[PDB]
Symmetry: C3
């Protein structure tokens, strides 16, 4: 039993429910639970597919702002960025297909999690985005590398620099999700997909997943290293401290370079 993830297996499908009330923030503990889920999924021969969704209104609204306050320093910040990067690389490397079922919102760290899953389905009105620059920070869980490789460099640029999220319907247009389903049947419609996948032989599922990883170049991996380093730098900068303080104080930050 994991603290913020509950898992129920039915017909070789592990349905994992993220439950870190009220917005399912990707805290350090949740990351540990994610790594444990992937370990469990990889060892259980009965499990052929995993579907991940959020409890409550949201898939996941972000990383946990409580771990990024004034009390945290630059080395811990780089390390926290790297914990999310490592965790989400474990998800993406999972030998069993992992589907993110998104309703409500997947923002920031939450979208970075979803992005590391092999497939995503969303409701039409779900909000997907990377609003980290509102805090004077950058995405630090590989979002700067994953997002442009989904939606292209230009859209990714716009989404990061404006911080504005896009709807599930728009994310479909831009290739950030696989498909949209109605809110009423959304989890069930995603489970239908999982059930089709569960019918295929494990060795072929594994093979497809492996062969899909060839787009992860050494330029990609070095980008992820760079992102973690930059994250720590901006985090401890005057502008990064101000951005985070402004958010907590419900005011518009003032950046000075």
């Amino acid at each position: 039993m994991l603290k913020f993830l509950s898992v129920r297996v039915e017909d070789h499908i592990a349905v994992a429910t993220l439950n870190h009330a009220p917005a399912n923030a990707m805290s350090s503990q949740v990351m540990h639970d994610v790594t444990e889920l992937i370990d469990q999924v990889e060892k259980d021969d009965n499990i052929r597919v995993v579907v991940i969704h959020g409890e409550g209104r949201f898939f996941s609204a972000g990383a946990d702002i409580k771990e990024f306050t004034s009390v945290t320093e630059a080395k811990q910040a780089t390390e926290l960025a790297q914990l999310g990067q490592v965790t989400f690389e474990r998800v993406e490397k999972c030998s069993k297909p992992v589907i993110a079922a998104i309703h409500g919102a997947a923002l920031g760290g939450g979208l970075e999690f979803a992005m590391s899953c092999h497939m995503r389905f969303a409701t039409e009105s779900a909000k997907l985005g990377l609003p980290e620059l509102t805090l004077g920070l950058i995405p630090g869980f590989a979002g700067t590398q994953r997002l442009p490789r989904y939606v292209g460099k230009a859209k990714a640029c716009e989404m990061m620099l404006t911080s504005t999220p896009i709807t599930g319907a728009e994310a479909l247009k831009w290739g950030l999700v696989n498909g949209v389903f109605a809110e009423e049947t959304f989890l069930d419609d995603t489970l239908k997909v999982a059930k089709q996948i569960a019918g295929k032989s494990p060795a072929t599922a594994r093979a497809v997943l492996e062969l899909l990883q060839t787009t992860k170049s050494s330029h990609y991996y070095e980008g992820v290293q760079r992102e973690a380093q930059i994250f720590g730098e901006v985090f401890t900068s005057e502008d990064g401290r101000e951005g985070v303080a402004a958010f907590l104080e419900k005011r518009k930050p003032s950046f000075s370079g």
Copy 2:
């Protein structure tokens, strides 16, 4: 010279019709014919563009699964995969533009053939997919590498793991075809494109085609090799045998790997 392809040159457009009854399956002999067609195209100064289409219902419904059952060892299955891979690479490397005109369906090996062409046009209702996993197999003619580079790895994953084809209209949305035409004037509309292309200088068409190949990395090429290796292993596995036997006998396979 060419058994299951016939080529007619009119107004600098080579129209190649694939006709390998019943389903235009991509057999070893077909591969040979395609290689010859490409050498012919490159060497005939009168040819400026090639349009490839299927005789009958389909562009091509897949590899020749009957011919697959002549295989008794992994190495032979890997060799058959490599033959397709080599054949389609010769297509993609062709110094004259090659258009696939898809009506009805392009599935499995047939989609892999179309994907090696420079451009693709389709009818709204055509079915395009990679259903090899229904056979306990994977795509082995570079489909694992080409498909995600068209539609994105998420959509490619869904396509391969579910085996469900997408329509021509959907393939357009996902970037797997260039365009869709009405089913009544489909081949005429594709030929209008080819005629526009035939108006350009041969050295410029060759230059454009060369310059487009920079999108293929070492990871792509290594991926193709790995795909061939995996293909042969899954082919002679119990589940591979079962899936092929089940398809041939028109029943649902029973996987237990």
Copy 3:
């Protein structure tokens, strides 16, 4: 050096640059120098946080400048002009501040190559976007052969270059060649609203985003740009290239030998 065919105003930390090389905003060598100066200015000025580039008159830019590609120009000079454009456009893409192209009317050939070198693009629904160089028996020489397929996919890029037919702004949005389309009546203003959102961000995070986005270009993209300039020169002095350009200047269809 005052800018010759560019003008720049700065408001709310947004440098608004207007290309004005009448009548079609052709990307001449002088225009390239102006663009390089703009990027130089923008990178030096801590007060500028974002750039929006648009065209004066009917077009963003209708092409490179035909006056530099006549029978009097030889091969070495043609390759060097291709290289000028490529290097200028790489300066734009490598800019440490966000650059937005706001396209109305048309962005064609060298003009689209320019717009493609910017980080984002917005267009009107009826703007024409394309690479029509093969009409002249030439190829795109300002990195279009490498940038275009990385926006729209190799298949669509192939079709655009081989047919020379432009696509609409609305189609360009579908194919990922622009970020968005706005109404022709509020077009520049709608683009400036985006610029203003971006100018609210810390300069270090904006720089970091841009740098981290560079990783999408392979070593083969860079080799490809160099090969493109090499081919451009060869085709430029070839019988077919000389004929495409002469036919264009004479307002007739070209007839090509091979």
